[PDB]
Amino acid sequence: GPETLCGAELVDALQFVCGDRGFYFNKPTGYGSSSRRAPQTGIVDECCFRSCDLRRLEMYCAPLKPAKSA
């Protein structure tokens, strides 16, 4: 995951941050249709280096961090 690959804790992040059926991969409005910079959540420039952190991708999808919308 982290400290390896580059997009292991990012792709799986949303796949595990949105839940198991919702994670809208930049579905809701993008910025260059994937590719070409990605200054926002660094979902592609996060662990890519050594930052498998989050606190940003939790707003990419899912109705809310914890269960239940509200």
From Swiss-Prot:
Region called A, residue ranges: 42-62
Residue ranges of the region described as C: 30-41
Coiled-coil blocks: none
Domain of life: Eukaryota
Molecular function per GO: growth factor activity; hormone activity; insulin receptor binding; insulin-like growth factor receptor binding; integrin binding; transmembrane receptor protein tyrosine kinase activator activity
Keywords: Deafness, Disulfide bond, Dwarfism, Growth factor, Intellectual disability, Secreted, Signal
Chief localization: secreted
Region annotation B: where it falls in the sequence: 1-29
Location of the region described as D in the Swiss-Prot/TrEMBL record: 63-70
Compartment(s): Secreted
Effect of substituting residue 36 to E: Dominant-negative mutant, no effect on IGFR1-binding, defective in integrin-binding and the formation of ternary complex with integrins and IGFR1, defective in inducing IGF1 signaling and cell proliferation, and suppresses activation of IGF1R by insulin and tumorigenesis in vivo
Disulfide feature: 6-48, 18-61, 47-52
GO biological process: activation of protein kinase B activity; androgen receptor signaling pathway; blood vessel remodeling; bone mineralization involved in bone maturation; branching morphogenesis of an epithelial tube; cell activation; cell population proliferation; cell surface receptor signaling pathway via STAT
GO cellular component, one term: insulin-like growth factor binding protein complex
Disease link: Insulin-like growth factor I deficiency: An autosomal recessive disorder characterized by growth retardation, sensorineural deafness and intellectual disability.
Protein family according to the UniProt entry: Belongs to the insulin family.
Job description of the protein: The insulin-like growth factors, isolated from plasma, are structurally and functionally related to insulin but have a much higher growth-promoting activity. May be a physiological regulator of [1-14C]-2-deoxy-D-glucose (2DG) transport and glycogen synthesis in osteoblasts. Stimulates glucose transport in bone-derived osteoblastic (PyMS) cells and is effective at much lower concentrations than insulin, not only regarding glycogen and DNA synthesis but also with regard to enhancing glucose uptake. May play a role in synapse maturation.
Subunit structure: Forms a ternary complex with IGFR1 and ITGAV:ITGB3. Forms a ternary complex with IGFR1 and ITGA6:ITGB4. Interacts with SH2D3C isoform 2. Forms a ternary complex with IGFBP3 and ALS.
Protein name, UniProt field: Insulin-like growth factor 1
Naturally occurring in which organism (per UniProt): Homo sapiens (Human)
Gene name for this UniProt entry: IGF1
Residues of the full protein shown: 49 to 118 of 195
